[PDB]
Symmetry: C5
Subunit: 308 residues, 5 copies
C-alpha cells in the first residue's frame, strides 16, 4: 500500500568543509519518481511544469511529498525544480540543490585524515506504510586532475535504504512510527602535499636546528641561543595555528610543536646543568657532546612513537 | 477555557558559539499539539498538510497560533512545515528550525567554563487565559564521540513551564497580561584539551625558562637576554589573542600572560639592582643565585593565589 | 484631523557595534496604537491577526501606516507581526524587529569612550497633519551581570518626539512638508577592563623596560639592544592593530605606541650622541646616567599632555 | 511622444568601501515623478499607496517603469516603497535603497588618493522615445565633524543626464535604442591621518634607525645587527599588509617597504665590502666613516625621486 | 519541431576569484530570443512585461523556458526580468544576473598562472528535440592592459554550442536524452607585478643576505646568526601565507621559501662541519671561504632549473 519512490542523486561538487562546525557543502540534483492515478495530458506526450507552476499544481491537489535532507544545516538553496507529469500515471520531481550538511568528523589524524561526506534523505511527514524509498541511485563525476582538488574522492558512493523508528511520537498507532531513509556515503582523504612541504618539513628542520644549540663552544653562547630558538617555535605555532583549520583538539602538527617546545626546554635544563654538575662549576664538555646527537636520537625515538 | 498546547522540541545540533555576542546556534524540530472543533477529513484517516498549504488553511480560518522564540536573535531559518489535522478535533504542528539564540554567558573561567544553552518559547499574541503550555518534552541524542565535539553536554535537558507578567500593556485589565512560557536548558562544559596542551603548557615552559636568566654569569648577558624574553611573551600574547575568543574581560590564560610580563619586568628591576647593591656598588652575584630559585618560588607562589 | 499614534519600543539587545561603519545591532519589539472607525469583531472581544493575514486585511483597506527607522541600514529583519483589532475603533500593531542602526560614533577616547545608541522613527508617507506621534514609551531590561556585557548601559532611555522640515516638495500648499519623529537615545560606556590589563599595562612595562637600555655599560651593548627594542614595539603595534577595532584615526593606545617608537628613536640619538659628543672619543657617560631618569621622566611627562 | 521622468536622489551614507571588488555602499532614497492618466481618487486629494499595495495597482495595469542602477552589484536592498497618485494625472514613486555600487578606483597614490563615488541610473526596458529623464536633482547632507568619517567629500554632487547607444539590440530596429541615463558623481579624499601617524612615520623612524648601523664600530657588530634590522622590516611589512586594504598593485607604503629592504641589503653589501677593500686586510673604516651620512642622503636622494 | 532559442550574454564584470573553492563572480545580462504563437498586442507595437508581471503571463500559459547556468553555485541573484512580446510571434527574455560560477582552476604557476572564466548554459527541462540553441553571442568590455584590473584578458569570448547526452532518466525512443548547451570561455592571465616586487623580490634579498653568514669572522658568530636568519624565514612564511591566496598545493613562492629553509639548514650543517673536520682542532677557513659564493652559485644555479 505505501507509495514506492525511486530516488536519484547527482553530486556535482563537495566543497567548503568547515572543521569546527563539522559541515561541508554539496551541490547537486535530486530526482524522485513515483506512479499515481493516470492523467490526460496535452498530447499523449508527457507534461512539463517548471518552478512556480508546481505550486499551482500542488494547490489544486497534486501529491508531491516533501523529502527532507536530515543532516542539512539550514534550508538548502534550491535552484530550478521540475515536474514531468506522464499520462500513464508516473510523475518525476527534479530539482537542483545547494546545501550545508553535517556529519561527525574526526580531524585528529590531520593532515592525513579520512572523512566521509554524507547525505541522508527521508520523507518529512509520511511513514513507510504511506511512503517508501524503493531504490537509490547515486552519480558522481570522475575527477581527472586531482591536485587541482583539495580532497580526493576515493571510491564510488555507497547507498542504503533503511528504516527509522521514532520512539517519541504523537499517536503511536503501532505501525505508524517508522520512516524510509536513503543514506549516501562518499569516502575521501585529504591531499596531504601542501601541509607536508610547507609546515611539517620546515618544523622538522627547525627542530633539527634546535639541537645544534649544543655545538656552541661557550655556555653563555648555548644558553642565550636557546631563547632565540624558543621564539622561533612561538613564531611557528603562530604561523600554523593562524593558517591551519581551527579544532578542539591537538593534531599531528600540534604535537610536533609541543615537542619542539620541550626539546628546547629540555636542552635548557641540561645546558645549565652542565654548568654546575661537576664541582668548580666547570662547563661539562663530556655530557654535552653526547647530547649533541643523543637528543637527535632520543627525540627521534620517543617522538617516533605516536599512532593514536 | 484557555487552549492547552503540548510542546515537544527535538534537538539535533548545538553549535556556533559566539563568545562576544553571547549566542549559539540550534538545529532541531518543534512540535505543538492541541484540540479544536472536530473535522471532516478524507477517509477517517488524519490529514497531512505540508509547507505551502498550511497558509491556505489558515486563510479559511484555521487557528494556527504563533509561538515565538523569545531569545532568538533574528528570524530563525525554518525548514519544512507540516500540519496534521485529525478528524477527532486535534491538530499537530511540526516544524524544523535553525536559529541563533541568546543567553547570558560568562567566559571568565575559560577554557574551563561551563555554560547552559537555552530556548525560551512563548506565544506571540495569546496570553495564558487564551493559550497555555500544558507540558514540555525535550529530546537530545546521546554522545559517544565526545572528543570530536567542542563542548561536553552534561545531563539531559531541564524543562520549565511558567508564566510571565508584562507590566506594560495597553488594554491591561490586569488579568490579561500574563503569558505562558516554556524554557529549556542544556548544560555543557568546554572541552579543555586543545587549550591545555597547546597554550597553557607552553606558556608555563616559557615563563619557567624565563627564570633561567639568573643562571647567566655576566650582567650584560642577563639584561640583554631579558629583552629577547620580553619579545617572546609579546609574540605569545599575539598568538593566543588571535586564536582565542575575543571577550570584554580577561581570562585565566590572559592573566598568565600578564604574569609572564611581570616576572620579566620584575627580574629586570633586580638584574639591574644587583649591579649596585650594598657598599662599594658591587657586582653582587650573591642575589642572583638566591634568585635562581627564590622567585621561581616567589612567582609560583604569589601566582598560586589566584582564586577568582 | 491628524491621526494620533502611540508608540512603545521594547529594547532587548544592543550588540554588534561596528566601529568603521559606525553602526550597531538592535533587537526589540515595536508597538503602535491609533484609533479609527469602530468595527464588528467576532464576539465583542478584540480580534487578533497574526503575520500573513495582516496582508489580507490591508488589501480590504485596513489602514496600517508605514513607520520607518530613519537611521537603520537596510530593511530590518522583522519577526512576527500582530494586529489587535478592537471593536470600539482602536487598533494595535505589534511586531518584533532586528536592525542595524547608524549613528555618529567618536572612538578617539578609546577604550574610555562614551557612545549613544539611537533609534529614529518616522512615518514614511504621512506628514504631521495626517499622522502624529502622540507619545513614546521606551522599555529596557535591568542589567544585573555587568562584566558579562561588553558595554555598560548608563541611564534609562531618553526619548523625544519632534518635527522635521523637508525642504523639497511636489505637493502644493507648502505646509505639507513636516513629519512627526520619535527619537530615542541610550548612553553607554565601554568596559575598559580587558584593555587596561592586556594592552595598556604591558605597553607601560614594555615602554618602561625600553629605558633600561641606559643601564648598559658598553656602547655596543646599548645601540645593538635598542634595535631589538624597536622590533618589540613593532611586533606589539602589530599585536594591537590586529586585535583592536579598526579605525580611520588614532586612539590613545595608537599614540602611546608612536611615542614608544620615539622613546626608542630618541634613545638611539643620545646613545650615539654621548659616544661622539666629547673630545678624544671620551665617552660622555654623563648623558647616559643623566638619562637614567631624564627619559623615565621626560616621557612619563610628555605623554601626560594627551589631554584631548 | 516620450514620458518625461524627473528624478531626485537623496544620499544618506556612503560607506563600506571594498578595495579589491572596487565597490562601496550607498544608502539613500530615490524619487521619480512623471505625469499620466488623470484619475478618480478618494477625495480630490492625492492617494498614497505603500509597499504591498503597489504591486496590486500594477496588476490593474498601472505603469510603473523599472529604473535600474547600472553600476550596482546584485539586487539592492529596497526598503519602503510609495506611490503618490495625484488626480490631476501625476505620479510619484518614492523608495529607500541600500546598494553596493561598482566603479573604477585607482589606489596607487594610497593613502593620498582621491576617489569618486558614483551612481548610474537607466530604465531597464524603455528607450528614450518612450521614457526620457527630464531632470536630475541630488541631495546630500553637510557633514558636521569630519574625522569621525573615514572619507571627506570635496565638492557638491555632480549630475548629468545623457543618452546611451546599445549597438547589439532587440531586432536591428534602427533608432529606437539609446537610453536616458542619469549619472551622479561625488568626489572624495581619504582621511589620511591614521596612515601617516601609525604607518608612514614609524616606517621612516625604522628606516632611519637602520642607518645608525654604520656607527657601530666593529664589523661583526654591523653585520649581525643588519639581520636584526632585516627581521624588523619583515615584521613591519606584515603589520602593514595585514592591516591596510588589500590590492593587486604596489602603493606608496608598499614602495617605502621595498626601499627599506634595499637600504639594508645595500648596507650589508657595504659593511662587508669595507672589510675587504684595503691591503693587509685592514678594515676600511674610511668608507664606513663616509657612509654614516651618505645613506641618509643617498636613500633620501635616489629614494626622494619618487613622484609616481 | 524544436524551438530555436538564440542567446546573447553581456558580461559586465568578472571578479572575486575564490582560489580555494575554485569559483569566480560574474555580473552581466542574459537575453534569449525565440519565435512563438503570433499575438495581439496593444497597437501593432511590441509589448513590454516587467518583473512581477512575467509571472502572470506564465500563468495564462506563456511559455518561458528555464535555462540554467550549469556551472553556477547556488541560485544566482537575478535583478530585473523583462519580456518583450512581439506581434509577429517572437519573444525576448532579458534579465540581469549576478552569480558565482565554477570551473577547474590550476593555481600552481602562481603568480604566473593563466585561467579561463567559464559560463555553461542549458535548458533545465527541455531536450534538443524540444528546445535548441541556435546561436550564442557574447559581449564583453574592451578595456586593455589595465592595472586597476588584477587580470589581463587575452581575447574576446570563445564559444561552443553542443549536445549533451545524459545517460540517466526515462527516455522515449532514446534520443530524448540529449540537451543543447551553450558554453563560453574567457581566457586571462595573472598580472604578476605586485607579486614580484612585494614578495618574490624581498624573498630573494633575504635568501641572499642569508649567505653573508659565511662572511662572519667567528664560528660563534656564524652559528648564532643563522638561527636568527631561520627566524626571519619563518616570519616571512607567515607573512606570505597570511596574505597570499590559500591553496591545497605549493606555488612558486612556497618553494622559494622552502628553499630558504634549506639554504639555511644546509649552511648550519656546514658552518658546523668546517669546525671539526681536521686533526689539530684547526679552524678550517678555506672550506668556508669556498662556500661563501659557492652557495650563491650553488643556489642561484640549481634553483635556476625548475620548469614545471
Ligand atoms: Cl530517552
Amino acid at each position: 500500500r505505501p507509495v514506492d519512490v525511486s530516488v536519484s542523486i547527482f553530486i556535482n561538487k563537495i566543497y567548503g568543509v568547515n572543521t569546527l562546525e563539522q559541515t561541508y557543502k554539496v551541490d547537486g540534483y535530486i530526482v524522485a519518481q513515483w506512479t499515481g492515478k493516470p492523467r490526460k495530458t496535452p498530447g499523449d506526450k508527457p507534461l512539463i511544469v517548471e518552478n512556480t507552476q508546481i505550486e499551482r499544481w500542488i494547490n489544486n491537489g497534486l501529491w508531491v511529498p516533501a523529502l527532507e535532507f536530515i543532516n542539512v544545516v539550514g534550508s538548502p538553496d534550491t535552484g530550478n525544480k521540475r515536474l514531468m507529469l506522464f499520462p500513464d500515471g508516473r510523475v518525476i520531481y527534479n530539482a537542483r540543490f545547494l546545501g550545508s550538511f553535517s556529519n561527525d568528523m574526526d580531524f585528529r589524524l590531520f593532515p592525513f585524515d579520512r572523512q566521509q561526506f554524507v547525505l541522508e534523505l527521508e520523507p518529512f511527514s509520511y511513514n513507510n506504510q504511506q511512503l517508501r524509498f524503493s531504490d537509490i541511485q547515486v552519480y558522481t563525476e570522475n575527477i581527472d586532475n586531482e591536485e587541482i582538488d583539495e580532497w580526493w574522492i576515493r571510491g564510488k558512493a555507497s547507498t542504503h535504504i533503511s528504516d527509522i523508528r521514532y520512539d517519541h511520537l504523537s499517536s503511536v498507532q503501532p505501525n505508524q512510527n517508522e520512516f524510509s531513509r536513503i543514506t549516501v556515503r562518499i569516502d575521501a582523504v585529504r591531499n596531504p602535499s601542501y601541509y607536508l612541504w610547507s609546515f611539517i618539513l620546515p618544523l622538522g628542520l627547525i627542530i633539527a636546528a634546535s639541537w645544534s644549540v649544543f655545538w656552541l663552544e661557550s655556555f653563555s653562547e648555548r644558553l642565550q641561543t636557546s631563547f632565540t630558538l624558543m621564539l622561533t617555535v612561538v613564531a611557528y605555532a603562530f604561523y600554523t595555528s593562524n593558517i591551519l583549520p581551527r579544532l578542539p583538539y591537538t593534531t599531528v602538527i600540534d604535537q610536533m610543536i609541543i615537542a619542539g617546545y620541550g626539546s628546547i626546554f629540555a636542552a635548557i635544563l641540561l645546558i645549565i646543568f652542565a654548568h654546575h654538575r661537576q664541582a668548580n662549576g666547570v662547563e661539562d664538555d663530556l655530557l654535552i657532546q653526547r647530547c649533541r646527537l643523543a637528543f637527535p636520537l632520543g627525540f627521534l625515538a620517543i617522538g617516533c612513537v605516536l599512532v593514536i
